[PDB]
Amino acid sequence: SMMQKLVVTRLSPNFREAVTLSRDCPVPLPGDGDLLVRNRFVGVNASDINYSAGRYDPSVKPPFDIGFEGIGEVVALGLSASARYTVGQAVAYMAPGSFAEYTVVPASIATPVPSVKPEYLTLLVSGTTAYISLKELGGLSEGKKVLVTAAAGGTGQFAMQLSKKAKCHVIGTCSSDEKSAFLKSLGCDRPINYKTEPVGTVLKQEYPEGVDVVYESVGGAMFDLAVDALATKGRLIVIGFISGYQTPTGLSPVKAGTLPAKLLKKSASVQGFFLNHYLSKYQAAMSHLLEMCVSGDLVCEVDLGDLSPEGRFTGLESIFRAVNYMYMGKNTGKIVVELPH
Ligand SMILES: NC(=O)c1ccc[n+]([C@@H]2O[C@H](COP(=O)([O-])OP(=O)(O)OC[C@H]3O[C@@H](n4cnc5c(N)ncnc54)[C@H](OP(=O)(O)O)[C@@H]3O)[C@@H](O)[C@H]2O)c1
Ligand SMILES: O=C(O)Cc1ccccc1Nc1c(Cl)cccc1Cl
Ligand SMILES: O=C(O)Cc1ccccc1Nc1c(Cl)cccc1Cl
Ligand SMILES: O=C(O)Cc1ccccc1Nc1c(Cl)cccc1Cl
Ligand SMILES: O=C(O)Cc1ccccc1Nc1c(Cl)cccc1Cl
Ligand SMILES: [Cl-]
Ligand SMILES: [Cl-]
């Protein structure tokens, strides 16, 4: 009858100062074409703080719901939705407002899943971003050199593995030796701990002809190193720039004043990617990722905070700590929060 959810009550990139936990919210009811899903796991995404800052659509004022992805059980549904779905069914979804005990989701956008496991949730946003961007914009083929930044993170783990499956030589940046050991276990050809080894020098010395593709999630100084490291006809994919999101504008400073000259001289490109412009590819990407995940052909690493200071991310209240965990760069794999029941 009543539930908890997170609500953006003031616009800010500081998630804690933007987002309030409301305790006595009515449970929303599904319409004819809708599922009501009881969330068991929810995904934490770097851009949750871009969302809370109001950067997705600056015309929209608080209050609004938050959280982009969920997995759980159908506990109620509209009559039309009941032709494809049934009460008790395990479903996952990408839609705003997953940070709630219950979320209304139109049946048309639900993804049926084998059971309610956090591994499947890693595929929804993190997996599909890596898959679709690389398939559509990567031009991957055997022997290409691929550099992945935030490689041990939520989407990075997939960009790594998909590039390896495309028979590419893959370099991955991360911030610790434990993350480097994880990258290695995924088949990474050259893991780099950027805190202990200078990435620019590694690339100049070991990849003098440059890299063919960059999956670039970090921005700032890493973006700059990436541009310099591009091969002739190289492609830098701008997936994100997380080093900037906490700032007031959300941007990360770059020394890009000579970027056009660099790109002309190399016949190289900088290509942006936004998931929501490629939704026509989503179902097929999800289907392929799910098959690999269920068959054990894809590592879907989940970080539920079990080794964080206050331990497992349980409950909506832990989302605040989970966002901090990401922004301290502590996670290995996809950060997920559990709503126990
Ligand atoms: N374009 C799209 O449609 C789309 C969709 C989804 C996600 N993305 C992008 O994918 C990237 C990763 O998102 P995610 O949600 O999967 O997170 P994640 O990679 O699981 O976590 C972020 C990681 O980035 C590094 N990092 C954290 N804060 C940093 C900082 N202030 N400066 C530099 N590096 C920092 C850390 O790894 P290290 O150990 O490597 O430092 C941290 O583990 C983001 O840029 C996100 O916006 C884009
Ligand atoms: O907006 C909707 O109706 C749900 C929906 C469906 C498919 C893809 C994206 C979205 N929503 C959405 C939006 Cl509008 C912004 C940021 C993140 C997400 Cl998941
Ligand atoms: O199917 C399409 O035409 C693209 C599209 C546009 C808006 C919202 C969703 C979708 N596709 C879609 C579907 Cl059909 C199921 C699950 C997830 C997504 Cl993103
Ligand atoms: O470019 C290609 O065709 C290879 C390619 C690139 C990016 C993403 C996926 C794929 N292929 C691919 C496919 Cl189609 C399914 C499962 C795993 C992989 Cl690596
Ligand atoms: O994630 C990013 O870096 C880009 C971005 C910016 C603002 C709002 C959403 C998104 N990405 C995004 C989208 Cl477009 C759909 C579902 C889930 C996510 Cl995390
Ligand atoms: Cl649709
Ligand atoms: Cl760096």
Q: What H or E segment, with its residue span, contains residue 73? A: strand 69-77
- The CATH number covering residue 24 comes to 3.90.180.10
Residues 156 and 274 in one domain: yes
Three-state SS at 202: helix
Closest residue by Cα to atom 19, ligand 2, is 95
156 lies in the same domain as 247: yes
Helix (H) or strand (E) holding 293: helix 282-295
What does the alpha-carbon distance between residue 272 and residue 221 come to, in Å, rounded to a whole number?
17
Residue nearest to atom 6 of ligand 5 (CA): 47
Annotated binding site for NADP(+): 155, 175, 179, 194, 217, 239, 245, 273-275, 331
Q: Which atom of ligand 4 is nearest to the CA of 161?
A: 19
Dihedral over alpha carbons 178, 180, 186, 188 (to 10 degrees): -170
Out of 8, 108, 109, 279, give the residue to mutate to test ligand 2, the one with the largest number of ligand atoms within 8 Å of its CB.
109
Q: Are residues 97 and 186 in the same domain?
A: no
Where on the phi/psi map is residue 187: left (φ > 0), alpha (ψ -120 to 50), or beta?
A: left
Cα distances (angstroms) measured from residue 175 to each of 1, 179, 195, 279, 332: 45, 7, 6, 32, 10
Distance 152 CA to ligand 4 centre (A): 20
Tell me how far apart the 2 most distant CA atoms of the chain are, in Å.
Answer: 63
User: From the CB of 150, is ligand 2 less than 6 Å away?
Assistant: no
Distance of CA 109 from the midpoint of ligand 2 (Å): 10
Alpha carbon distance 54, 63 (integer Å):
11
Q: Which atom of ligand 5 is nearest to the CA of 242?
A: 3
Q: Are 79 and 22 in a shared domain?
A: yes
Q: What is the CATH number of the domain that holds 294?
A: 3.40.50.720
Which spans in 62-214 are helix H?
118-121, 128-137, 156-165, 177-185, 199-206
SS3 category, 140: coil
Identify whether residues 23 and 149 lie together within a single domain.
no
21 with 59, same domain: the answer is yes
Ligand whose nearest atom lies closest to the CA of 96? 2
Pair (259, 319) in one structural domain:
no
Structure resolution, Å: 1.9
Question: 7 in ligand 4 pocket by Cβ < 6 Å?
Answer: no
Q: Are 209 and 123 in contact (CB under 8 A)?
A: no
**Which residue type occupies 163?**
S
| Domains contained in the chain, number | 2
Range of the domain at 149: 122-300
